[PDB]
Amino acid sequence: HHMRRIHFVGIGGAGMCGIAEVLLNLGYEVSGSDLKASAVTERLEKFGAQIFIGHQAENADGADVLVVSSAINRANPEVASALERRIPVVPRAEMLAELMRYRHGIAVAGTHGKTTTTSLIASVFAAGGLDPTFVIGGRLNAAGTNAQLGASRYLVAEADESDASFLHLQPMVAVVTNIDADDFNKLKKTFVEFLHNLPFYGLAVMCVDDPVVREILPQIARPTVTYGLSEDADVRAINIRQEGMRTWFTVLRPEREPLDVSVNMPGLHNVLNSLATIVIATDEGISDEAIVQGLSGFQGVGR
Amino acid sequence: HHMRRIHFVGIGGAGMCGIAEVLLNLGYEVSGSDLKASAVTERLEKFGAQIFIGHQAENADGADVLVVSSAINRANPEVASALERRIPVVPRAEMLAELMRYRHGIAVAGTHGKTTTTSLIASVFAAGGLDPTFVIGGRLNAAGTNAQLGASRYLVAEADESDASFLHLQPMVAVVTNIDADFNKLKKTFVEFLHNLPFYGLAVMCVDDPVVREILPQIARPTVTYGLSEDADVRAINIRQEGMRTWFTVLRPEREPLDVSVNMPGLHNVLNSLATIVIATDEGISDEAIVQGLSGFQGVGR
Ligand SMILES: Cn1nc(Nc2nc(N[C@@H](COC(=O)N3CCO[C@H](CN)C3)c3ccccc3)nc3[nH]ncc23)cc1C(C)(C)C
Ligand SMILES: Cn1nc(Nc2nc(N[C@@H](COC(=O)N3CCO[C@H](CN)C3)c3ccccc3)nc3[nH]ncc23)cc1C(C)(C)C
Ligand SMILES: [Cl-]
Numbered sequence: 001h002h003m004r005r006i007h008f009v010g011i012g013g014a015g016m017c018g019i020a021e022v023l024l025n026l027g028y029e030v031s032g033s034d035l036k037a038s039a040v041t042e043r044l045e046k047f048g049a050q051i052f053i054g055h056q057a058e059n060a061d062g063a064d065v066l067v068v069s070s071a072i073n074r075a076n077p078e079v080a081s082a083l084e085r086r087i088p089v090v091p092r093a094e095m096l097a098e099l100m101r102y103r104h105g106i107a108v109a110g111t112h113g114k115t116t117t118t119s120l121i122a123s124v125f126a127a128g129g130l131d132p133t134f135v136i137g138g139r140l141n142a143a144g145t146n147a148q149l150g151a152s153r154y155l156v157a158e159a160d161e162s163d164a165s166f167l168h169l170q171p172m173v174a175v176v177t178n179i180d181a182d183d184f185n186k187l188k189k190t191f192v193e194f195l196h197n198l199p200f201y202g203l204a205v206m207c208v209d210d211p212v213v214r215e216i217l218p219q220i221a222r223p224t225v226t227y228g229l230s231e232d233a234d235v236r237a238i239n240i241r242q243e244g245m246r247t248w249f250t251v252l253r254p255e256r257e258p259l260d261v262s263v264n265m266p267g268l269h270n271v272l273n274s275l276a277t278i279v280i281a282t283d284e285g286i287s288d289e290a291i292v293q294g295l296s297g298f299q300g301v302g303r
Numbered sequence: 304h305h306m307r308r309i310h311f312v313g314i315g316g317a318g319m320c321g322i323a324e325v326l327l328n329l330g331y332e333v334s335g336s337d338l339k340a341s342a343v344t345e346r347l348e349k350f351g352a353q354i355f356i357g358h359q360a361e362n363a364d365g366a367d368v369l370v371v372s373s374a375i376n377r378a379n380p381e382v383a384s385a386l387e388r389r390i391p392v393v394p395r396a397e398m399l400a401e402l403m404r405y406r407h408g409i410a411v412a413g414t415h416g417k418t419t420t421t422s423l424i425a426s427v428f429a430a431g432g433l434d435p436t437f438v439i440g441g442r443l444n445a446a447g448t449n450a451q452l453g454a455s456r457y458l459v460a461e462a463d464e465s466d467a468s469f470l471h472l473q474p475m476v477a478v479v480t481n482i483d484a485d486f487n488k489l490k491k492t493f494v495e496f497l498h499n500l501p502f503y504g505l506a507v508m509c510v511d512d513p514v515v516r517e518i519l520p521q522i523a524r525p526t527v528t529y530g531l532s533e534d535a536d537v538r539a540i541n542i543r544q545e546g547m548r549t550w551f552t553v554l555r556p557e558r559e560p561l562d563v564s565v566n567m568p569g570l571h572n573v574l575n576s577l578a579t580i581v582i583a584t585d586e587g588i589s590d591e592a593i594v595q596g597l598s599g600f601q602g603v604g605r
């Protein structure tokens with residue numbers, strides 16, 4: 001193990017403080033510098049972080065890896081010391097992606113629906129007592145009764161194809177909701193390469209109502225479950241009854257009896273977000289009752 | 304776990320049976336078809352494989368993944384049935400690369416020296432009692448004479464920059480021996496390969512090679528450099544080239560200088576041996592096992 005101590009440059013900053021908390025919960029030694037002590041830094045040192053105030057070269061001493069907010073700025077004395085000694089320096093987006101190596105990672109990709117689907121997954125998993133850490137907008141959150149970031153077995157994260165870290169995710173389950181052309185063939189290849197980062201025992205969850213996902217499906221040499229309203233979708237919504245703030249539908253699933261559910265958000269697109277979620281919940285062994293509870297009690301993204 | 308049963312079309316092949324053997328050792332259900340039974344299929348059956356003689360669609364029933372030799376032949380009934388059901392069908396090279404995921408994988412890349420370096424690493428790891436499975440030229444081997452492949456935690460494999468799986472390998476340790484001539488794109492491919500290491504992995508880099516030296520600062524992974532270069536972390540000095548045999552002393556961080564020998568001439572074989580020494584040292588292998596493994600190696604394929 002060539003990573004024992006991880007040093008964050010600007011550990012009090014957004015996205016940085018959650019990553020540090022996860023790494024502390026994975027058992028690593030974590031240190032960090034910041035220009036000002038705050039409630040964020042005082043909470044980090046109660047979790048075991050060594051906090052330095054201000055930037056000076058000595059703050060990097062002993063670190064095996066440095067994490068920086070984005071750009072690598074050799075004008076910063078901690079970064080300059082690390083670079084002079086060939087200590088790796090990585091942006092926070094890459095360390096965030098690296099967390100999936102330690103957890104059962106569920107990556108939610110596609111043009112539209114990533115945030116809502118990530119949130120619905122977290123809600124249904126919490127209703128089943130699985131309490132994942134989930135990542136929306138680069139920020140780590142804890143679902144359910146478990147308050148410790150990264151303590152859960154599960155890590156659910158939006159996967160944005162424009163991020164440099166997109167193709168370095170190592171998920172166990174990957175969803176593609178849709179692929180929207182607003183080079184298109186480079187883009188399709190990017191999504192195909194993303195899905196091939198799954199292990200052979202992993203799962204690709206594919207919306208076949210989307211034309212481009214349907215087009216790339218035969219290229220995916222990984223186990224797949226398809227979903228949609230389409231007559232050939234593995235996991236299919238029928239009997240859709242739109243009723244105000246809430247939509248009722250029946251979900252057909254391989255080797256299961258039909259299940260009547262509802263989602264407390266309007267629009268066909270939220271039936272599709274719920275179907276992705278049901279595929280993932282079903283794969284994880286979550287009960288019908290918890291699926292119903294998590295979809296119908298969902299209070300919205302951010303609530 | 305969405306892969307319980309792996310089915311090999313043509314499992315009696317020399318390059319298929321070893322992959323099947325490892326998957327059996329990993330606890331998977333394995334089945335395979337071939338045109339005729341053989342000592343190979345019987346060995347696999349004794350390890351737990353279900354063997355079908357003849358090709359028919361039904362041989363693939365229950366499989367989660369099919370493995371074929373290379374090309375996907377939609378005329379084969381087992382392949383056609385799998386494709387109709389969205390069962391993945393993958394060439395053996397891609398299943399071979401995937402084994403690194405289950406093991407402590409050591410990937411040996413670079414334009415020159417991959418086969419010899421992989422072989423020396425296997426020899427030293429065997430001398431250290433670690434019983435490695437290793438891959439050269441697409442062939443799985445193990446040091447143990449009468450052994451099932453994949454028994455040990457260690458998997459050492461050549462990584463060819465021209466293979467479709469090169470950028471999907473998931474090693475714990477990766478060597479780049481040299482990068483020798485678009486060329487700007489080749490550099491990028493080796494840099495991307497090295498970033499497939501976890502942050503707690505290790506990149507072993509020959510700084511005598513000008514292009515490896517050039518890309519070294521781009522590698523945001525822990526690194527150990529080697530070579531004859533004065534600034535190499537792990538350095539060969541005191542080199543005496545005596546017939547087909549070379550003696551040299553290796554300097555390592557935090558260790559006393561160690562005199563070794565290799566019975567293959569040429570400075571490139573000093574470099575192949577240095578890469579091996581870096582990897583063996585990192586793994587905690589003793590001086591005695593390094594000395595024995597290097598000196599006893601008779602040559603690739605011997
Ligand atoms: C929060 N939210 N959540 C969504 N969720 C999903 N939406 C879609 N589809 C979109 C239609 O999308 C396109 O019209 N596109 C995209 C493809 O490219 C096309 C140009 N070539 C253009 C959709 C919109 C409305 C009703 C039904 C389906 N499919 C999905 N599958 N699983 C989840 C899911 C969608 C949204 C919005 C749009 C409200 C932000
Ligand atoms: C079995 N084997 N094992 C090797 N191992 C290594 N070789 C090298 N460097 C090569 C660079 O060789 C070139 O670039 N050449 C040589 C051929 O003709 C090229 C025209 N383009 C120019 C080298 C060759 C000779 C002396 C010193 C260094 N560096 C290494 N680092 N760690 C291991 C290692 C090399 C070999 C070969 C196949 C060459 C015999
Ligand atoms: Cl955060």
